Symmetry: D3
């Protein structure tokens, strides 16, 4: 409510969640029919339309655990959302994981304290909904995409103090780093709904390639198609 200026009914049961509200705009204009914009509070654009006849929503979450914490909670509790598919970007930690590859997050490691606080310092592993993982994987394979499914690192920090810090995570099989998933999976689990993160590799700690701002906003089409086809099967 304080953050989404709309009524229950305005948002579909399944929603795609880019971090960038302008990417939500792009998805809505490019892939959906009969689009209605239901939110402009804080510029966090949210749209509802149809994809091949099925109602779907798309809305920006902003960057970081706390921002997506706010939007995922409100979407679930106040708008009755049941399936949440993050479509985001991430920096590769693996030579095997290339700029513009698509990755499924089975789980999310994190340096956020959100769960450390709640479990008295133990290690909760935020985990994807298996059904969504399986469906998204199958759709991807049927499309010719060599999609990997594994652990991603959700960081609070884009500009770390130590340029070599990523290497410890990569040694333990972490595919890439992004900034939202540990929170999305935690909240989905807590509230009894379903969540999946798909990512497009936008930067690389191996080769140091950086995609442009325009490229991230309007050209990562493969992940969007996977997410939409996934939504269609839910």
């Amino acid at each position: 409510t304080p953050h989404i200026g709309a009524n229950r009914g305005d948002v579909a049961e399944t929603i795609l969640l880019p971090g960038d509200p302008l990417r939500a705009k792009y998805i809505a204009e490019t892939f959906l029919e009969d689009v209605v914009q239901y939110n402009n509070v804080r510029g966090m654009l949210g749209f509802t339309g149809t994809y091949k006849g099925k109602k779907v929503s798309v809305q920006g979450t902003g960057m970081g655990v706390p921002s997506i914490g706010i939007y995922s909670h409100e979407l679930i509790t106040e708008f009755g959302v049941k399936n949440l598919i993050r479509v985001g970007t991430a920096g590769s930690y693996q030579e095997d994981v290339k700029v513009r590859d698509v990755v499924i997050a089975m789980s999310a490691s994190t340096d956020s304290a959100i769960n450390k606080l709640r479990f008295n310092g133990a290690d909760y592993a935020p985990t994807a909904s298996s059904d969504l993982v399986f469906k998204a994987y199958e759709i991807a394979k049927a499309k010719g995409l060599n999609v990997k499914a594994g652990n991603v690192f959700t960081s609070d920090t884009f500009y770390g103090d130590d340029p070599n810090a990523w290497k410890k995570w990569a040694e333990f099989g972490v595919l890439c780093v992004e900034m939202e998933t540990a929170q999305l999976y935690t909240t989905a689990a807590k509230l009894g709904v379903n969540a999946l993160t798909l990512l497009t590799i936008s930067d690389s700690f191996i080769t140091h390639e950086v995609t442009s701002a325009e490229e991230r906003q309007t050209t990562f089409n493969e992940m969007i198609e996977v997410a939409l086809e996934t939504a269609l099967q839910l």
Copy 2:
């Protein structure tokens, strides 16, 4: 051209910047208080503007909500665009009976439940702290404006919707004035990079009372805060 989060050139951003959380509030500040306004950023809709206030160049830009979001923007602004003075202008919820709605709070420091510094200092407690020159200038301006100003510790929360309704009380017992979501990061980043930072906050609600205020009332108080921030900007 720019950074992956700010699509502008060096020179497009003034040396002093105001930092509302909401990019629509940046647009409002720019339209309301600045002359000859140019928009330098639209990446991710994170509106940023540059204009003059009483003849002096000043910028204003949304940061998004939360420590990680402002961490990205403050870092890029300082290292890529040469920003020297960063003044957050936000809203907060009061934890104290004598911190009333429509009061202005100056953050001397920020407590937090974010893990950003716990990681950095091997589990020790770093206290993110405001630039004193900015605290002193802002206080004297606010006072002379006749405003009800408090200066103290604020709580930078990582979690808006927490498990425990009463958890704020522990912080309130230890004198914390109010809760917001950005300041510990702003102060840490400015300290690391050797620049100047200040957070000003209008009290928009109270965990203690349930006083209601009109939109006109809220606008007037917000404008007062912005004036304090801009008159501060003038003296740097």
Copy 3:
């Protein structure tokens, strides 16, 4: 010859291994499902066997209970004996009403109260995660076998007899399927060493219901799990 915990030579262990906690369960699996069985380990009574399943070499070995115990065995098996695929086959207690006794759980990941990774990552939260190729193969086999299969997060407990009877509930609220004592270590070690790991679990009891099952019933379900693990082994 060997390591201080496995008294065998390189070559004695197949590239894929099943890992019951109980070495008497390793003996049972070997006798029941494997041909031309050779025992390669008796050090500390930690029985390990190598035989063929449908003509393919496969090993099976007890790990002991707990993160430190499986930490020793998995490390030695991988680094000294060249094991590439490690499939734990265990029992677990259900934390969920729809995770019923005699169900099979595939661990996609493992939460834990062990400090092994807290130490490694400076207090951050590493999520030990299964090899997806093994998760996908095992799921499809179990499904086609008509089994009631769930795939999700399991809790690797350091303490069987804890101070607090209700402590599991916090984990259950956050979707944890069941509790066991080895998986976070198995997944972390396999990830570090660049090999493949999977945990399969039969639900032996419930924290929610108190359903009773016969030994024949328990044997049948256990055999089904082993078949899934061995049919998975076949495709690697």
Copy 4:
């Protein structure tokens, strides 16, 4: 009571708190009139007198968070003290911060666990009373002292294992290291009273200058004058 051998009434509402009881003695003999010694328990000297007609107290706290924890608590709860002004010494972490400079602590970073324990591992920032900060700053400026006001580090450890450990703190703007303030500010906040720390730089991690024991006890007059003038305005 177990630690201060005196009755309510014997201590003034405003008190100066050096760590060194012999420095309390010095302040009392040098700056106060009509001095009465109210405490000698454990040799922790405490005096009450007048400064320009206003009643003030001065008492040693001992070194370290736990010692000042004891004395600040007893002073507030049993003796009705309302304003607590620590006048201490500290080692510089900044080239800008010279031996014999005076510093105001706006806040205190710490490696003490006192607050980690209480806030479930979150980061409480012990903070000075703004009124005292402003008054002390103004008095200092009117005296010709270039006083800095910023973050100080309260350590449990004088002799650290790592000779380079201080450098991380200095990178993040920490002015100097002392051993009391995080506790004084925490207790003052908890009990609803007012606190300020003034420090004289007695050692330097930059130049390695060390002042003598005599110098710390009887020659740091500038901070004492600021504190007394501050008390006078309260």
Copy 5:
């Protein structure tokens, strides 16, 4: 019960606890008369017999804090065991501590989280029963053994990532590393019974000597004799 397949009465009041069940077998066959095997669940052999006329038990615990946590709890609560003497192996952290030396653990440092969780992150020091320490020390000295008594490190990890990690512990006087004692001492203290760990040095971080599997199982006789003589006096 789930882990020990026997009835109250089958186990004596004093028990020796090697980690290795085959070492329990060795002790029982070599030192005890009238031996009965009371446990074979999970192959964790347990025996009861007499040593010089006094009933004693010996049982394997398995390796690691969680495994001994299980067996020590069941032994105490369900079988009425009152004295628990671990007879284990450990790797030396001190040039002074040689392969085949015998060590008494007065206390156990640990990297286990078992107590961090329980004491809100404070530092509980698991400590031996003084009576058993004194008796075992005296017996050892009367045998000609130069026995050391000090702090041992209970680790969850045999194969650490950092080959130099042990050096910090050795600097602070840690004698050797093993994998059970912090748990045994914690549980004994909690349940109000008595515990002692004796160790034989089986590996050395100084010289890199490694004893064989056979040697650990059947040749560490000196510690066994000390433990048995200790039991006899209880």
Copy 6:
């Protein structure tokens, strides 16, 4: 001459030192038990003395209260003045019914809520431990003196006035004998620097009973403890 906290020369301090928390107790010990006493320290009023006991040189010095205070004094004494044996002689509050007022406790080890070692060992649990030679000598002396002596774990508290009246109980359930404020630091420092340390404690009050004792009674028991410490000193 000296250190910033001890105003004396090398040679002024004996190789064995007794360490009361209270410097007035150091003065009392020196006057009561030592011959040919010289005061070597008055810095910060932290009285230190050197005299002979039965012809042997021994020192005695106040440490102040708390881990940080004794951290300074023990470090300087060892590294600058060549002290080899450090024996704290203090008071403590009992956590146990069979640890009665006027009993003597020998600290085998010290639990703590200080963060000194949590920082040092990356969040692991170091157990500060007494020198066994000193534990054994002191126990045998105390026993032969007919004293009621206990040897075990003590709790080194960082906070005298804690938030929670019942918090000691957790420690009491896990066998902790009593609470004091210095020992974890003393034992850690002596271990680091390769020297010998022991804490002896007279039980001055009880968290369990509320027994009252006369000053004469308290003096007698304290003198007994000092005798144990000094007879121990004699044999080093």
